[PDB]
Ligand binder design. Structure first.
Ligand SMILES: O[C@@H]1[C@@H](O)[C@H](O)OC[C@H]1O
Length: 313
C-alpha cells in the first residue's frame, strides 16, 4: 500500500523547518510513501489552498504545520468527509476534527527558558517576548515561562516591564520590539524572555546598540547554528535543543500508520476545543555554555566542522 502524504508547512525561515521537511520526507519515502510538500509563506489563505489542492490530488494523509492554528476547521472538515487522516505537526490545530498531534513538551520548553533566567537574574526587570500570536505553541511557552516566573513576580523580586508577541516569529520584528522596549524603560531591562533563537537574535542586536549585549540575560529555542555561537560568545544565555530527527522520523511513521487505517499509540490526549486529540510529546533539552559539546555536537545536530566552516571566505 503506497500511502500518499501531503505536507503543508508554514514557512522555511526558521533553521529547523528545512530539517523537519528533509527528515520527514526521507523517512516517509523509506516507508514506501509518496510525499508532496508545500509552504504557505506564512499566509493562512495560501495554506488553505495548498491543503485543498492536496485533498483534490487524493492524498491519504495530511501533515500540517499550521501558520495560524485557529482558521483550519473547515479545510479539516473537507479532509475528513473524504476519509483523509490529519496529523498536526509540531503545532496544535484548534477546533478541528484532526486525528493526531505530535510535538515536543512545549510547556516544559517555556519552564526551561524561565528557569535558566531566574538562576542568574533572580531580581530585576523582565521583558516577555513571545512568538507568533497565532501559534498555539507560543501560548504554551508563555504558560511554561509564567509557571516559573509567577512566584518571583508575586514576591516583588521580579517586575514584568513589558510583553509583546512577535509576528511571524521574525527576527526583524523582534529587533524593533526590543528597540522600543529599551526606549520605553530607559534601558532598564535585566532579562529578556525570548521564546526562540531567531527572535533572540533580533533582540540581541537591539541590546547591542545600547551596550547591553552580554549583560542582559536572554533565553531561546531550537539551537540554531547562530544561537549556539551566540551562547559560546556570551551574548545569549541558553537555548532549548529539540532533536528534530526524533520528531520527524516518528511523525513519518505515524503518518504512514494513519494512511493504512491503523491507530497510532499516544502518550496522552490534548483537548483542542473540539475533541481530545491523541498526542505524543517529546523531551526538550536545556542547552547552555557548558553542555554544547554533549548535546548538539555529540548528536551531530551541529558538527564541529559545521561550527567552524567559514561562510564568507
Ligand atoms: O521550534 C519552534 C516551534 O515549536 C514554534 O511553534 O514556532 C517557532 C519555532 O522556533
Amino acid at each position: 500500500k503506497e500511502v500518499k502524504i501531503g505536507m503543508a508547512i508554514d514557512d522555511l525561515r526558521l533553521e529547523r523547518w528545512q530539517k523537519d521537511r528533509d527528515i520527514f520526507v526521507k523517512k516517509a519515502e523509506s516507508l514506501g510513501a509518496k510525499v508532496f510538500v508545500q509552504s504557505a509563506n506564512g499566509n493562512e489563505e495560501t495554506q488553505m489552498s495548498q491543503i485543498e489542492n492536496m485533498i483534490n490530488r487524493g492524498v491519504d494523509v495530511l501533515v500540517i504545520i499550521p501558520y495560524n492554528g485557529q482558521v483550519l476547521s473547515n479545510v479539516v472538515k473537507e479532509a475528513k468527509q473524504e476519509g483523509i487522516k490529519v496529523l498536526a505537526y509540531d503545532r496544535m490545530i484548534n477546533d478541528a476534527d484532526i486525528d493526531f498531534y505530535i510535538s515536543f513538551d512545549n510547556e516544559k520548553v517555556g519552564e526551561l527558558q524561565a528557569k535558566a533566567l531566574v538562576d542568574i537574574v533572580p531580581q530585576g526587570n523582565y521583558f516577555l517576548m513571545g512568538g507568533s500570536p497565532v501559534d498555539n505553541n507560543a501560548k504554551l511557552f508563555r504558560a511554561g515561562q509564567m509557571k516559573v516566573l509567577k512566584p518571583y513576580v508575586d514576591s516583588g523580586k521580579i517586575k514584568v516591564v513589558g510583553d509583546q508577541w512577535v509576528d511571524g516569529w521574525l527576527p526583524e520584528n523582534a529587533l524593533k520590539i526590543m528597540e522600543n522596549a529599551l526606549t520605553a524603560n530607559n534601558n532598564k531591562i535585566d532579562a529578556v524572555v525570548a521564546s526562540n533563537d531567531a527572535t533572540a537574535g533580533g533582540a540581541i542586536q537591539a541590546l547591542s546598540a545600547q551596550g547591553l549585549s552580554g549583560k542582559v540575560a536572554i533565553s531561546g529555542q531550537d539551537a540554531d547554528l547562530a544561537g549556539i555561537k551566540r551562547i559560546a560568545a556570551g551574548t545569549q544565555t541558553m537555548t532549548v535543543y529539540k532533536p528534530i530527527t526524533l520528531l520527524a522520523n516518528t511523525a513519518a511513521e505515524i503518518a504512514v500508520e494513519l494512511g493504512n487505517g491503523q491507530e497510532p499509540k499516544a502518550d496522552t490526549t490534548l483537548n483542542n476545543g473540539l475533541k481530545d486529540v491523541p498526542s505524543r510529546l517529546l523531551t526538550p533539552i536545556d542547552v547552555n555554555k557548558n553542555n554544547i559539546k554533549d548535546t548538539v555536537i555529540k548528536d551531530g545536530f551541529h558538527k564541529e566542522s559545521e561550527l567552524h566552516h567559514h561562510h564568507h571566505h
